[PDB]
Amino acid sequence: NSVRDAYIADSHNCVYECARNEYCNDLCTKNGAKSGYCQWVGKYGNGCWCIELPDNVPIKGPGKCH
């Protein structure tokens, strides 16, 4: 799909940890998403969650952070 809700990730399949929701909204929106927030608990633990992130930007998927 063109866009998806998920943990934004780097090129190493690593989530971006967070301490503030604002950090995540900024990170997500500057990468094309509608909004974002900090997940202190979730499928992969602490990390930024983005809403409608374009598919040219990585998301956390099954596998290790390398």
Describe it for me?
The protein is α+β, with helices and mostly antiparallel strands and 66 residues long. It has one helix spanning 21-29; strands at residues 3-7, 35-39, 47-54. The protein has a single domain, classed as Knottin, scorpion toxin-like (Defensin A-like). The chain contains 1 helix and 3 strands. Strands 1-3-2 form a 3-stranded antiparallel beta sheet, covered by helices on one side. It is globular and about 25 Å long. The chain starts with a strand and ends in a 12-residue tail after the last strand.
Features:
66 residues; alpha+beta; Defensin A-like
What is this structure's SSE topology?
Elements: E1 3-7, H1 21-29, E2 35-39, E3 47-54
Antiparallel strand pairs: 1-3, 2-3
Summarize the structure.
By secondary structure, the protein is an alpha+beta fold. The chain has one helix and three strands.
- What fold name goes in the CATH topology slot? Defensin A-like
Number of helices: 1
* CATH H level, superfamily name: Knottin, scorpion toxin-like
Q: Could you give the distance between the termini?
A: 25 Å
SSE series: EHEE
Largest sheet: 3 strands, antiparallel
The first-level CATH class is given as Alpha Beta
Q: How many structural domains in the coordinates? A: 1
Strand line-up in the sheet with most strands: 1-3-2
**Number of beta-strand segments:** 3
The second-level CATH architecture is 2-Layer Sandwich
Helix share of residues? 10-25%
| Rg result | 10 Å
Percentage beta strand? 25-35%
Shape by Cα distribution: globular
The structure class reads alpha+beta
